[PDB]
Enzyme design. Structure first.
Site, PDB file in Angstrom:
ATOM      1  N   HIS A  41       0.800  -1.215   0.000  1.00  0.00           N
ATOM      2  CA  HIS A  41       0.000   0.000   0.000  1.00  0.00           C
ATOM      3  C   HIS A  41       0.836   1.271   0.000  1.00  0.00           C
ATOM      4  O   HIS A  41       0.287   2.351  -0.246  1.00  0.00           O
ATOM      5  CB  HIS A  41      -0.960   0.018   1.201  1.00  0.00           C
ATOM      6  CG  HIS A  41      -0.280   0.212   2.520  1.00  0.00           C
ATOM      7  ND1 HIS A  41       0.076  -0.841   3.336  1.00  0.00           N
ATOM      8  CD2 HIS A  41       0.095   1.337   3.173  1.00  0.00           C
ATOM      9  CE1 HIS A  41       0.648  -0.372   4.430  1.00  0.00           C
ATOM     10  NE2 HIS A  41       0.672   0.946   4.356  1.00  0.00           N
ATOM     11  N   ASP A  90      -6.770  -6.398   1.344  1.00  0.00           N
ATOM     12  CA  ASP A  90      -6.392  -7.800   1.412  1.00  0.00           C
ATOM     13  C   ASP A  90      -5.185  -8.066   0.521  1.00  0.00           C
ATOM     14  O   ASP A  90      -4.963  -7.374  -0.477  1.00  0.00           O
ATOM     15  CB  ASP A  90      -7.562  -8.694   0.998  1.00  0.00           C
ATOM     16  CG  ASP A  90      -7.343 -10.150   1.358  1.00  0.00           C
ATOM     17  OD1 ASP A  90      -7.306 -10.466   2.565  1.00  0.00           O
ATOM     18  OD2 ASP A  90      -7.211 -10.980   0.434  1.00  0.00           O
ATOM     19  N   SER A 187       4.315   0.653   8.536  1.00  0.00           N
ATOM     20  CA  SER A 187       3.698  -0.265   7.543  1.00  0.00           C
ATOM     21  C   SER A 187       4.775  -0.772   6.577  1.00  0.00           C
ATOM     22  O   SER A 187       5.671   0.021   6.222  1.00  0.00           O
ATOM     23  CB  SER A 187       2.574   0.412   6.805  1.00  0.00           C
ATOM     24  OG  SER A 187       1.375   0.375   7.566  1.00  0.00           O
ATOM     25  N   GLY A 188       4.683  -2.043   6.174  1.00  0.00           N
ATOM     26  CA  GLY A 188       5.670  -2.645   5.258  1.00  0.00           C
ATOM     27  C   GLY A 188       6.786  -3.332   6.025  1.00  0.00           C
ATOM     28  O   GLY A 188       7.656  -3.949   5.380  1.00  0.00           O
TER      29      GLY A 188
HETATM   30  C1  LIG Z   1       1.232   1.516   8.559  1.00  0.00           C
HETATM   31  O1  LIG Z   1       2.072   2.383   8.472  1.00  0.00           O
HETATM   32  C2  LIG Z   1       0.253   1.420   9.677  1.00  0.00           C
HETATM   33  C3  LIG Z   1      -0.094   0.189  10.235  1.00  0.00           C
HETATM   34  C4  LIG Z   1      -0.926   0.126  11.340  1.00  0.00           C
HETATM   35  C5  LIG Z   1      -1.442   1.293  11.906  1.00  0.00           C
HETATM   36  N1  LIG Z   1      -2.351   1.295  12.995  1.00  0.00           N
HETATM   37  C6  LIG Z   1      -2.371   0.381  13.976  1.00  0.00           C
HETATM   38  N2  LIG Z   1      -1.473  -0.590  14.166  1.00  0.00           N
HETATM   39  N3  LIG Z   1      -3.394   0.462  14.827  1.00  0.00           N
HETATM   40  C7  LIG Z   1      -1.109   2.521  11.341  1.00  0.00           C
HETATM   41  C8  LIG Z   1      -0.276   2.583  10.239  1.00  0.00           C
END
Ligand SMILES: *C(=O)c1ccc(NC(=N)N)cc1
Ligand SMILES: *[C@@H]1O[C@H](CO)[C@@H](O)[C@H](O)[C@H]1NC(C)=O
Ligand SMILES: *[C@@H]1O[C@H](CO)[C@@H](O)[C@H](O)[C@H]1NC(C)=O
Ligand SMILES: *[C@@H]1O[C@H](CO)[C@@H](O)[C@H](O)[C@H]1NC(C)=O
Ligand SMILES: *[C@@H]1O[C@H](CO)[C@@H](O)[C@H](O)[C@H]1NC(C)=O
Ligand SMILES: *[C@@H]1O[C@H](CO)[C@@H](O)[C@H](O)[C@H]1NC(C)=O
Ligand SMILES: *[C@@H]1O[C@H](CO)[C@@H](O)[C@H](O)[C@H]1NC(C)=O
Ligand SMILES: *[C@@H]1O[C@H](CO)[C@@H](O)[C@H](O)[C@H]1NC(C)=O
Ligand SMILES: *[C@@H]1O[C@H](CO)[C@@H](O)[C@H](O)[C@H]1NC(C)=O
Ligand SMILES: *[C@@H]1O[C@H](CO)[C@@H](O)[C@H](O)[C@H]1NC(C)=O
Lengths: 235, 261
Positions: A41, A90, A187-188
């Site tokens: 993403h 997904d 994320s990632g």
């Molecule tokens: C990615 O950058 C990402 C993943 C997960 C969250 N939120 C939570 N773990 N609640 C934000 C951003």
């Protein structure tokens, strides 16, 4: 990571920091000598120009790129998972090929891969990493943060996450009262769980309702399902 | 949000929604490109000038509710052609709320096995990239095919209990056959383990001969490569129970400690 502590230099060698135009967006997971694993993403819409992604291998502090252990590399191929769907979030997983090979050192080691049909029991603690954000409405952290979150069942996660559709390719992880959970700029990255003195890759940070919120766990892409798809590229 | 829908062969032509130099923001259109049973879709863009990563075109190959992904095009630049697999292709236009660009324009056509080149006849092995290599790179140690499919799976485990366990069944060109233990050593053992993608060798144990296939006698040479002669002649054969360890898995080799904090 919002309620975690700083990680020692070299404690997470398989955590790669990906930059896009001189700015880190989403961490990765070193799997092979030239392949990575990142959430699909943040590379969604940027796989056309792989040369804009610089993979910083073995990074410890985000202001010490002149380290003798940091090995920067370029990306030449970004393979997004075919079953990806941004609207359903997904199959959020993607692999990024490195420009040149990187030698293995004490501060740069490839992450493991979960074997087929590996049951991860709920309530089992798993460690995360990444230069994320220590607070939702704040600024990112310079030092490589780390935390520990337990695994939750898919049914409990679906009961706690009614706004989304937790499929069989999502392994959630998070506390009951919150406080410790991944946030933006994480994320990632990987969801590492120790097993037989080995740190497997049981998840990649995909999405979540909000970070540092009670009774709101984060969703992680189950790498146990994409094992063959990743191994098809490492050969 | 309310653009056109399923198109067919008589038209094959469509802009996005507002071709003259400016498309509306917050747009979400879908052009379900249909075809006949057994005909794929080749989408060629005559013009593609959109915004940055914020605005993308998601070309899919659904054929059902579980839509796959083919390409995510964005930014001003000539994009390549997209060759579908099924008789249905879905194109999505996701746009932001500011900085509207011009727009794109494409025209598809229905054909038979478009994109995928015709496999060359006369015993010509076709790898993933499309080129033909009869026997010059069929698991011999070269790099003819750039996709690496020339060096694809030819040796694998046979009747394996666990994941990193089983036989050492090889394949010269087509026939999958096992290997003997005439001069089996640890060097060639870890070499084969590395060829399988695993770590080094461990506990090579011959058990008994049970396979009637053309077993091959694995040998070694100082050149570096493994010369395997598929000769079917041997007395009291023995099948190697290959057991390879894992690679450099998630083992922290730095100077770390144990602290409950
Ligand atoms: C990615 O950058 C990402 C993943 C997960 C969250 N939120 C939570 N773990 N609640 C934000 C951003
Ligand atoms: C970067 O890290 C290394 C190892 O921790 C250290 O020796 C070096 O001084 C650091 N760089 C700066 C500018 O302090
Ligand atoms: C890795 O090791 C090889 C051989 O030991 C050496 O030639 C090379 O310079 C090293 N570094 C990289 C980045 O390949
Ligand atoms: C996980 O870690 C927390 C905090 O260190 C601890 O309270 C909990 O008991 C751990 N879970 C298990 C199953 O040991
Ligand atoms: C989640 O998606 C599945 C897919 O078939 C569907 O059956 C289920 O009803 C959905 N649940 C929710 C809460 O949307
Ligand atoms: C082609 O476009 C015309 C114009 O709207 C439409 O009437 C016709 O049905 C289209 N062709 C097919 C096969 O639907
Ligand atoms: C689209 O139209 C152009 C010009 O008419 C043509 O050259 C091109 O081949 C068409 N696209 C496809 C996929 O056939
Ligand atoms: C393993 O060997 C036994 C011999 O009795 C045979 O019946 C079985 O089909 C073999 N399995 C595989 C996967 O080759
Ligand atoms: C090894 O190979 C030689 C000839 O290359 C053969 O004579 C011998 O029987 C083989 N097996 C051994 C030495 O165990
Ligand atoms: C491989 O063999 C060595 C030496 O016998 C042994 O110490 C090691 O535990 C073996 N590996 C496994 C995974 O059992």
């Amino acid at each position: 990571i919002v309620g975690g502590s700083n990680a020692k230099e070299g404690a997470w060698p398989w955590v790669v920091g990906l930059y896009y135009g001189g700015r880190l967006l989403c961490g990765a997971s070193l799997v092979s000598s030239d392949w990575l694993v990142s959430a699909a993403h943040c590379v969604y819409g940027r796989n056309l120009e792989p040369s804009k992604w610089t993979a910083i291998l073995g990074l410890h502090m985000k202001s010490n790129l002149t380290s003798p252990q940091t090995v920067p590399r370029l990306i030449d191929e970004i393979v997004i998972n075919p079953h990806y769907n941004r609207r359903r979030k997904d199959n959020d997983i993607a692999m990024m090929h490195l420009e040149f090979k990187v030698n293995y050192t004490d501060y740069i080691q490839p992450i493991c891969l979960p074997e087929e049909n590996q049951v991860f029991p709920p309530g089992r603690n798993c460690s995360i990493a990444g230069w994320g954000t220590v607070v939702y409405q704040g600024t990112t952290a310079n030092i490589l943060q780390e935390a520990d979150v337990p695994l939750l069942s898919n049914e409990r996660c679906q009961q706690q996450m009614p706004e989304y559709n937790i499929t069989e390719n999502m392994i959630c992880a998070g506390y009951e009262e919150g406080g410790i959970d991944s946030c933006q700029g994480d994320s990632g990255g990987p969801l590492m769980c120790q097993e037989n003195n080995r740190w497997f890759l049981a998840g990649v940070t995909s999405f979540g309702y909000k970070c540092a919120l009670p009774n709101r766990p984060g969703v992680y892409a189950r790498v146990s399902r994409f094992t063959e798809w990743i191994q098809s590229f490492l050969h | 949000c309310g653009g056109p829908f399923e198109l067919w062969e008589p038209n094959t032509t469509f802009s996005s929604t507002n071709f003259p130099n400016s498309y509306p923001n917050l747009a979400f259109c879908v052009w379900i490109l249909n075809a006949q049973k057994g005909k794929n879709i080749q989408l060629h863009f005559q013009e593609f000038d959109l915004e940055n990563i914020n605005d993308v075109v998601e070309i899919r190959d659904g054929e059902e509710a579980d839509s796959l992904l083919l390409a995510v095009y964005t930014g001003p630049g000539p994009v390549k052609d997209v060759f579908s697999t099924t008789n249905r292709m879905t194109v999505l236009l996701i746009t932001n709320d500011v900085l509207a660009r011009g727009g794109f324009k494409a025209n598809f056509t229905t054909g038979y096995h478009l994109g995928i080149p015709e496999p060359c006849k006369a015993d010509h092995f076709q790898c993933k990239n499309g080129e033909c290599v009869p026997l010059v790179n069929l698991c011999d140690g070269h790099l003819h095919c750039e996709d690496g499919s020339d060096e694809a799976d030819c040796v694998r485990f046979f009747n394996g209990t666990t994941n990193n366990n089983g036989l050492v069944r090889f394949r010269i060109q087509s026939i999958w056959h096992t290997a003997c233990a005439e001069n089996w050593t640890t060097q060639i053992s870890n070499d084969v383990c590395q060829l399988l993608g695993l770590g080094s060798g461990n506990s090579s144990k011959p058990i008994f001969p049970t396979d009637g296939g053309p077993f091959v006698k694995l040998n070694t040479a100082p050149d570096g490569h493994l010369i395997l002669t598929p000769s079917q002649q041997c007395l009291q054969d023995s099948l190697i129970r290959l057991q390879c360890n894992h690679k450099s898995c998630g083992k922290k080799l730095a100077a770390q400690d144990i602290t409950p904090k």
